[PDB]
Design a protein around this ligand. Structure first.
Ligand SMILES: [Zn+2]
Ligand SMILES: [Zn+2]
Ligand SMILES: [Zn+2]
Lengths: 129, 86, 457, 1224
């Protein structure tokens, strides 16, 4: 099997169809010139290709910027690929585990937009944990 | 003619501390923590703690060391606060 | 949005308690109903519920834990209700058992009663038989079994009526009786025969298997949670067998040793105590064999006097509790084999023990029931009554105790069964069992008014 | 005041003082009794009959040395003469008989002031007056009120009780006259009884009189076993050991009604009596026994209620022996016929009125009909024409004028009904001013003022009504005072009868005692329920049966229940009753809202979440506002169900009021009575101690009698339990306090008794002695109080357990001190001591049960008796215990016939030695135990008994050193394993056990062991140890093989035999030069025996040995020098004592140098140690002279501190509990 994908960047990416069918949308249009892939660039594509070929049955694979990880989670949202989503959410979870709210604010570039009375009274009831 | 012998050794560890061997300063004085921010809010509770193993430390020193590791530093015995006569 | 819940799903409860303080949108994503529903049900609270019927599942998760803490403080103090099964005139209590808050008791006149300790009502019916003394009684979630002195055995179904569904007859006395905690099989030990009774597909209560032993049986238990064929464990003097009803097999676990003094069977392993003996004395011990292969796993004991009781099937995982003749209760670690707690609780021998994740309840031969909190290493309370403590059984919110005879005190009695309830907001208005009911609506209204008059926590 | 030092506390800030003697009589036992008044001050009075012994025992200052003419009456047939006559002392007293009754009667009809004050100033006179036939027939209204004022003056009390908690009734004068008559008759009969065949008649007359009084009073005031229980009330109620003709009381309750029948009915009933009971019927016979069978009484009851009046039947119904053997006119009467006949034919009216005053229920219904204008003008004319009749006044007008006082408060004003009401009220109040008085008491003045004086001009006679009401304003308060005085007198009399039944044991025969007590002890909320889905089942929500429910039929969320409240009723509690049996029919979220009408329902009040395990759900607590309509909406069921099921509702309004005064009186009187009886008993217990063996029967009799009274006369069990608790707490607490407290010599009665119980068990006394002692001590401890219900718990916390425990502790301590003083030097001290301690424990558990407080008291007693020993005696005892444990451990390597018994004895000895925990002898015990365990561990491999003993007696060691020794013994095996592995991997068997300071008592190791070819292994091990983590000593042992012999020697022997094998003969010179040992003589000693291979052929220089015992030619040869035991008396213990005496002075110096503020203990220890090591004041001379015993740990200083705290030289701060300071 060999099928081509027409990416956003204009480049064509041909890959063996069967193991790549883990995305339900591409196989859907397959059994229903390449298929247009208009939402994400090539780097995510080859990332997921070498990932799916590696995973038949990726810690270091994701040691990249935050932006590209967001782009890949949104791609797997469009791709509907269980593995990419599971592993990226697992690594983000293990990233956020064991931290202070301000350590979260450092973690995900989110500014503390809570007033002081709100900051106190939120951590008086929520203490139980 | 000798077939079995049970020899006994003796390991000497003679070190007269006379000081809190955690922070190495005096035992009746204050520890490094209470010596840095001296008299800021309260300092009248930097007291001494005696262990069953017959060693004495500042309360702060040995408390945080126990937070780290759960034996006595000098003898490697399971730490236990001395409550005999207290 | 689903990406947010995909990120937060793996997030534990602890840091979820913090992520609700960094934003308003992060607050409303940290208060999701599905996440808290999952955290609650997966933690045990409210199993058979639906995410629809309640709202703000975080506050429900808070309230359940607050209720559990209140229950624990009710245990630490003595807050709740207490009741006692009334004395039967001119008779003596002979045997007591209880499965799930339902007690069964047998007296030295042939009488057998049951009474549910979970209701505001009060019916303690007598179980009919169509003169000898009762030897043993056992109760199940559905069945009741009684063994008499003349070698007879009655079996009642607690869901149909107060008349026996099977009446078996031996040739000699009965030395031991056991009832399956989950299934519906019965096991008895006559002079030299051990037999298992069980219903066939049409429910006719036939004989499943028969065995033979060379000595008299002293202890007999049934292994819980067996798939197809039941398995029993018998202790004949200084021998210990393993009876399998598949092909009537009789394996031999342990032989050529001192006599056995106690016995307890869990789903996977069996624990039993043996005396100490010899010209050069060998101390008393507790042995723990495995039922998979019959291989001994542990051999515990550092005691000068014999062991008298052991509990393994109720203990938390990797722990076991025991009571000795010197009056001490001990906690044994099953991984390392060492002691975890040795506590001098009684004056005479210890006759009943039970433990859970934070407390121990033990009853002695002098008549005392004592409660200890081994997490903080502090006593909680104790209660003294006349005769030796013969039965003890508690749950997370209730306790059942029996003092059975063999001038002892000022308050005289001839057998006393007492129930303690540490959460009165769970007592029902009538019993789930059809037989534990009445028809005199006068008494119904009387106890209904009494229930409505009781104070609140 | 006069006796202030004899007050008895009745509670928190409430005491009782003896005041004064009042009366005197002879008791039922022939002896004199004395009535004594007590005063209750935080002022009420209590009268108590006391004998001479109780007076001596409670207030002895009331003892001292011993126990504390004719024509003047004829000329009146001219009143000043009679007044001056009655001025004399005995004149009126003697003239009581000759018509002075009629004389003072006609005189009463301010001149009567003297005539009525003379004799009254100088009880039977007023009784003679009050039953005069012409008292109310021939007299006016003014002299009537004068007589009533006289009576109200006569029946006053020096200390009444508050009555402003009950609705006092309004009654005319005749009711007060009859009440005063009955009251004075009862008082006369009572005082006759005090100053006295004939007495049986007196008691019968008294019982009937008081029965009649109770009946009249109650009618005048119109007053007519399994269960869960709280866990704190488990053992709070005292326990009392359990145990065909009508009784005299029950037969008198029936004779009371038989004695009020009419001639015909009386004759017929006496005939029915004579039928079964053959013979004659005499007055002295009908009452004496007249034993009736139950069947005769039952048929008599079945025929009685017909031939009675209305009041007689009202009494008979509530009776005890009965509760045991039991046009507008026509349109109103439709709901009686005699009322219509009267309304029509109102001359045959007199018979109708006569038959009406016997059963005036229709009359009362008619007058109550007034509170629609139809029948009012029809019945007001009848009333106004009935007032004009001679004997119609007898009807109960006062009982039906609550209706009339509702029309004068109604919106209808200036009408015709008001004019006729005013006219009728005017007629009724003018024919007799008594009704003016009852109206003034009702409040008619301001009522008619605000009702007519604002609207119209006195429609018919309203001004005159207001005038008459304001006139009888004065008599209103007189009437109130009279009735309240009679009520208080009757209450005091019933309390007196109760006390008399307690003192004596005669039963109570007064007819309506139980009914009166019940009345004295006891002083829907919704219109409709409307549900949405199923209307024909809503009755089951309030059915009061939980087996029946209301099931809904509708959509999810549309179910609700609507409650229409009644006016003014607030909501105290609202609960919903559900059952977890219904799985999906159970509610899951309830919302309760309140509004003014079914249409608005705007403000919701509460929202609740129901859990899967819930039965009683509280929806609303005690509210403040009133809500007309309350709706309960069930939002969703469990598991998404669609229909709901409810088992019940429960609405509770405000709490009722019950006048809590008589209850307090009952509890006060019971408490004081028993607190006096207890002090009376304690004197008998104190003068002859042997009498203690009878106290249990007395206490049990008292409790049984109290229970028998409560189970017969009190209303419910909530009162019986309170009275039982009060009786127990008042009777037992002072008895215990008395028999527990010591005397001039220092022994108490109970202490003496327990000492006899203990010391007489050796064997004499006999078994019944022991049984009785056990019964007493078990009775005394069987009640545990909680740390009506508020009345029984009135007072301080109990002190029974405290006194008992301290007495037992003192007994135990005296026993142990006698034992230790007698025999502390014996050879068999430890076994006898442990047997004694076991006997003490057994006797404690069989005297008080296995209760924790008494075991603690026993342990404290032994620990206190051990601390009275000087230092050297405690040292000797500790050493003996350690040596005994050592011998018992070692004697197990070789078996025995009875080993289980030996191990049980060892267990008892360990239980005995556990007392040392936390005392100051623990350090000495640990010292000797280390010294012996060390020699035990290095002579054999091990025993399993070591860990078994340590598991028991671990806490007894302040430093936990034996545990460390055992642990190190285990660790060395692992170290040798690792060394063997590393040796065989990094390519004469030896085993190395390495000691240290923090794991072994290295204080007696001075020498140090190279002589032979084994240095290689030792150096290899030294290198391995220094790499993976040293010095060798002269301890250990070796197994050697010598030809056909196998050996077992020490190290200081192995090396010597090696040197003898490496040469021909060796002398002592090279021995000492190479070794350094000082010891060696005892080492080469055991070789001289026949088993020893060597012969020490002493040189003619110093000595020399050679193997010459091998010429005369098996199994183990244990040629190891045996162990010797220390001696606490010798130079060992004396150095320890000197060290302790030095540390004491050091500690007190350093503490005196810091003042009253004190010193923290953990810094005191550091200062003492740093002053002991580099000691300028304790010069190093003595510190060196001590030798073995010159080392100081922290536990030594802590033991000296405990010693000083015990002596009192030191003191612990109260605020900061572990800061010490010098005392004195
Ligand atoms: Zn320090
Ligand atoms: Zn500090
Ligand atoms: Zn240490």
């Amino acid at each position: 099997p060999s099928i081509k994908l027409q990416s956003s960047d204009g480049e064509i990416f041909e890959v063996d169809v069967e193991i790549a069918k883990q995305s339900v949308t591409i196989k859907t249009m397959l059994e229903d010139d390449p298929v247009p892939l208009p939402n994400v660039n090539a780097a995510i594509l080859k990332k997921v290709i070498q990932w799916c070929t590696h995973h038949k049955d990726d810690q270091e694979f994701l040691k990249v910027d935050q932006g590209t990880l967001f782009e890949l989670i949104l791609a797997a949202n469009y791709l509907d690929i269980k593995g990419l989503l599971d592993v990226t959410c697992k690594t983000v979870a293990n990233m956020i585990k064991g931290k202070t709210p301000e350590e979260i604010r450092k973690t995900f570039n989110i500014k503390n937009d809570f007033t002081e009375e709100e900051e106190a009274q939120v951590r008086k009831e929520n203490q139980w944990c | 003619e000798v077939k079995k012998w049970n020899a006994v050794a003796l390991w000497a560890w003679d070190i007269v501390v006379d000081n809190c061997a955690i922070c190495r300063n005096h035992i009746m004085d204050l520890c490094i923590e209470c010596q840095a921010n001296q008299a800021s809010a309260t300092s009248e509770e930097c007291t001494v703690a005696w262990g069953v193993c017959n060693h004495a430390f500042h309360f702060h020193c040995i408390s945080r060391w126990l937070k780290t590791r759960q034996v006595c530093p000098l003898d490697n015995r399971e730490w236990e606060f001395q409550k005999y006569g207290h | 949005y689903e990406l947010a819940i995909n990120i937060f799903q793996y997030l534990d409860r602890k840091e979820l308690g913090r992520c609700a303080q960094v934003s308003k949108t992060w607050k409303v994503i940290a208060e999701d109903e599905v996440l808290w529903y999952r955290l609650c049900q997966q933690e045990g609270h409210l199993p058979d519920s639906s995410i629809s019927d309640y709202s703000c599942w975080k506050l429900i998760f808070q309230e359940c834990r607050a209720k559990e803490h209140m229950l624990r403080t009710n245990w630490k103090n003595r807050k709740g209700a207490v009741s006692e099964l009334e004395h039967v005139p001119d008779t003596v209590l002979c045997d007591v058992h209880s499965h799930d808050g339902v007690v069964i008791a047998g007296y030295t006149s042939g009488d057998v009663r049951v009474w549910d300790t979970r209701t505001w009502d009060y019916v303690a019916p007598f179980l009919e038989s169509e003169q000898p003394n009762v030897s043993f009684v056992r109760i199940n979630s559905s069945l009741a079994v009684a063994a008499y002195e003349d070698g007879f055995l009655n079996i009642w179904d607690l869901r149909t009526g107060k008349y026996p569904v099977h009446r078996f007859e031996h040739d000699a006395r009965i030395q031991a009786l056991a009832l399956s905690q989950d299934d519906a099989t019965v096991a008895t030990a006559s002079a030299f025969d051990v037999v298992m009774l069980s219903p066939n597909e049409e429910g006719y209560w036939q004989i499943a298997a028969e065995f033979e032993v060379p000595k008299l049986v002293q202890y007999l238990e049934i292994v819980p949670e067996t798939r197809r064929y039941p398995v029993a464990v018998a202790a004949a003097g200084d021998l210990m067998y393993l009876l399998k009803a598949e092909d009537s097999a009789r394996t031999l676990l342990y032989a050529h040793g001192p006599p056995v003094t106690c016995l307890d069977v869990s789903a996977n392993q069996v624990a039993f105590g043996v005396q100490g003996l010899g010209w050069v004395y060998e101390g008393s011990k507790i042995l723990v064999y495995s039922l998979e292969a019959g291989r001994r796993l542990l051999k515990l004991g550092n005691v000068l006097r014999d062991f008298t009781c052991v509990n393994l099937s109720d203990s938390p995982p990797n722990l076991m509790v025991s009571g000795n003749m010197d009056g001490r209760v001990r906690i044994h670690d099953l991984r390392s084999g060492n002691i975890a707690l040795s506590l001098s609780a009684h004056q005479l021998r210890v006759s009943a023990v039970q433990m859970d994740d934070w407390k121990i309840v033990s009853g002695g031969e002098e008549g005392l029931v004592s409660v200890w909190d081994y997490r903080m290493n502090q006593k909680l309370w104790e209660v003294y009554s006349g005769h030796p403590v013969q039965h003890i059984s508690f749950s997370s919110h209730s306790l059942i105790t029996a003092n059975v005879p063999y001038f002892t005190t000022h308050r005289r009695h001839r057998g006393l069964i007492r129930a303690y309830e540490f959460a009165v907001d769970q007592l029902a208005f009538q019993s789930p069992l059809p037989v534990c009911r009445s028809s005199c609506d006068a008494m119904a209204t009387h106890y209904y008014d009494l229930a409505l008059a009781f104070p609140y926590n | 005041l006069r006796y202030r030092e004899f007050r008895v506390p009745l509670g928190p800030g409430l005491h009782a003082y003896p005041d004064e003697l009042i009366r005197q009589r002879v008791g039922h036992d022939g002896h004199p009794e004395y009535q004594i008044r007590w005063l209750i001050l935080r002022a009420e009075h209590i009268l108590l009959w006391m004998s001479k012994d109780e007076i001596y025992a409670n207030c002895h200052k009331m003892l001292g040395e011993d126990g504390q003419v004719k024509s003047l009456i004829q000329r009146a047939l001219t009143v000043h003469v009679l007044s001056a006559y009655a001025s004399i002392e005995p004149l009126t007293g003697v003239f009581k008989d000759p018509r002075v009754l009629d004389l003072l009667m006609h005189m009463l009809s301010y001149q009567i002031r003297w005539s009525a004050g003379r004799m009254i100033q100088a009880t039977q006179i007023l009784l003679s007056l009050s039953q005069q036939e012409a008292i109310e027939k021939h007299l006016d209204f003014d002299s009537r009120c004068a007589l009533l004022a006289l009576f109200a003056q006569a029946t006053l009390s020096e200390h009444p009780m508050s009555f402003e908690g009950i609705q006092l009734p309004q009654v005319p004068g005749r009711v007060l006259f009859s009440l005063v008559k009955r009251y004075l008759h009862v008082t006369s009969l009572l005082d006759q009884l005090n100053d006295s065949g004939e007495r049986g008649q007196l008691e019968l007359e008294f019982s009937m009189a008081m029965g009649t009084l109770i009946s009249e009073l109650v009618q005048a005031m119109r007053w007519d076993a399994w269960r869960w229980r709280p866990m704190t009330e488990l053992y709070a109620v005292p326990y009392v050991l359990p145990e065909e003709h009508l009784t005299l009381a029950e037969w008198w309750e029936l004779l009371f009604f038989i004695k009020k029948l009419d001639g015909p009915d009386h004759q017929e009933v006496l005939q029915i009596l004579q039928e079964n009971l053959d013979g004659e019927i005499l007055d002295d016979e009908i009452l004496a026994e007249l034993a009736v069978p139950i069947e005769l009484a039952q048929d008599l009851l079945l025929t009685l209620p017909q031939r009675l009046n209305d009041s007689a039947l009202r009494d008979l119904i509530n009776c005890h022996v009965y509760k045991k053997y039991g046009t507008p006119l026509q349109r109103l009467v439709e709901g009686g016929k005699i009322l219509l006949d009267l309304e029509q034919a109102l001359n045959k009216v007199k018979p109708l009125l006569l038959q009406l005053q016997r059963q005036p229920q229709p009359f009362l219904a008619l007058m109550q009909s007034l509170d629609n204008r139809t029948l009012h003008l029809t019945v007001l004319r009848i009333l106004k024409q009935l007032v004009d009749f001679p004997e119609a006044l007898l009807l109960p007008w006062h009982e039906a004028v609550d209706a009339c006082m509702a029309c004068l408060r109604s919106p209808n004003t200036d009408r015709e009904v008001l004019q006729e009401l005013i006219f009728f009220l005017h007629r009724l109040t003018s024919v007799s001013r008594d009704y003016a008085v009852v109206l003034n008491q009702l409040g008619a003045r301001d009522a008619i003022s605000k009702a007519l004086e604002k609207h119209l001009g006195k429609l018919e006679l309203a001004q005159e009504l207001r005038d008459m009401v304001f006139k009888c304003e004065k008599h209103a308060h007189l009437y109130r005072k009279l009735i309240t005085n009679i009520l208080g007198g009757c209450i005091q009399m019933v309390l007196g009868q109760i006390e008399d039944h307690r003192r004596t044991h005669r039963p109570i025969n007064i007819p309506f005692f139980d009914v009166f007590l019940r009345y004295l002890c006891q002083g829907k909320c919704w219109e409709k329920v409307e549900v949405s889905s199923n209307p024909h089942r809503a009755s089951k929500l309030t059915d009061h049966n939980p087996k029946t429910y209301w099931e809904s039929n509708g959509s999810a969320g549309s179910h609700y229940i609507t409650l229409h409240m009644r006016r003014g009723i607030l909501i105290r509690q609202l609960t919903l009753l559900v059952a977890s049996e219904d799985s999906s029919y159970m509610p899951a979220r309830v919302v309760v809202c309140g509004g003014d009408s079914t249409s608005s329902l705007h403000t919701e009040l509460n929202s609740v979440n129901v859990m899967p395990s819930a039965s009683r759900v509280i929806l609303l607590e005690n509210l403040t506002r009133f809500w007309p309509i309350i709706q309960i909406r069930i939002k969703r069921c469990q598991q998404g169900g669609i229909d709901t099921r409810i088992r019940g509702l429960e609405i509770l309004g405000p709490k009722p009021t019950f006048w809590p005064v008589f209850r307090e009186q009952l509890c006060r009187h019971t408490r004081l009575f028993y607190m006096v009886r207890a002090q009376a008993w304690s004197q008998d217990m104190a003068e002859d101690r042997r009498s203690l063996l009878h106290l249990s029967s007395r206490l049990n009799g008292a409790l049984r009698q109290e229970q028998n009274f409560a189970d017969r006369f009190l209303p419910d069990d909530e009162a019986a339990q309170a009275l039982g608790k009060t009786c127990w707490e008042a009777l037992v607490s002072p008895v215990v306090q008395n028999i527990t407290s010591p005397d001039e010599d220092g022994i108490s009665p109970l202490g003496w008794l327990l000492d006899q119980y203990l010391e007489c068990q050796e064997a004499s006394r006999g078994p019944a002695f022991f049984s009785r002692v056990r019964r007493l001590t078990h009775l005394l401890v069987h009640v545990e109080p909680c740390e009506w219900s508020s009345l029984a718990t009135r007072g301080l916390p109990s002190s029974i357990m405290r006194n008992l425990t301290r007495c037992w502790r003192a007994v135990v301590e005296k026993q142990v001190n006698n034992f230790l003083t007698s025999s502390w030097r014996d050879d068999d001290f430890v076994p006898r001591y442990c047997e004694h301690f076991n006997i003490l424990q057994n006797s404690s558990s069989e005297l008080f049960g296995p209760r924790a407080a008494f075991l603690l008291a026993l342990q404290n007693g032994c620990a206190g008796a051990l601390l009275k020993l000087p230092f050297l005696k405690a040292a000797h005892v500790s050493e003996q215990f350690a040596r005994h444990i050592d011998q018992q451990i070692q004697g197990s390597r070789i078996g025995g016939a009875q080993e289980m018994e030996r191990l049980a004895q060892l267990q008892q000895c360990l239980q005995a030695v556990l007392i040392f925990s936390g005392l100051e002898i623990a350090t000495t015990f640990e010292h000797y135990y280390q010294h012996y365990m060390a020699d035990r561990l290095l002579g054999v491999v091990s025993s399993w008994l070591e860990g078994a003993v340590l598991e028991q007696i671990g806490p007894c060691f302040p430093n936990r050193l034996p545990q460390q020794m055992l642990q190190s013994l285990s660790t060395s095996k692992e170290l040798q394993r690792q060394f063997h592995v590393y040796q065989l991997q990094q390519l004469p068997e030896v085993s190395v056990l390495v000691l240290s300071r923090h794991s072994w008592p290295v204080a007696s190791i001075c020498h140090t062991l190279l002589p032979s070819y084994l240095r290689g292994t030792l150096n290899r091990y030294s290198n391995f140890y220094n790499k993976s983590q040293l010095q060798w000593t002269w301890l250990g042992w070796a197994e050697l093989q010598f030809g056909n012999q196998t050996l077992h020697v020490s190290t200081v022997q192995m090396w010597l035999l090696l040197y003898l094998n490496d040469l021909k003969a060796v002398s002592v010179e090279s021995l000492l030069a190479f070794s350094g040992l000082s010891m060696l003589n005892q080492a080469i000693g055991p070789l001289t025996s026949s088993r020893g291979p060597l012969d020490l052929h002493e040189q003619k220089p110093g000595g020399v040995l050679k193997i010459r015992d091998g010429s005369k030619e098996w199994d183990i040869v244990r040629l190891i020098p045996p162990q010797t035991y220390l001696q606490a008396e010798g130079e060992d213990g004396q150095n320890l004592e000197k060290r302790r005496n030095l540390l004491n002075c050091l500690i007190v110096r350093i503490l005196k140098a810091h003042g009253d503020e004190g010193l923290h203990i953990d810094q005191l220890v550091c200062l003492v140690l740093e002053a002991w090591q580099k000691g300028p004041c304790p010069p190093r001379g003595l510190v060196s002279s001590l030798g073995k015993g010159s080392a100081c740990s922290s536990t030594d200083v802590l033991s000296c501190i405990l010693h000083l705290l015990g002596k009192g030289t030191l003191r612990r701060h109260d605020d900061r509990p572990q800061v010490l300071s010098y005392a004195v």
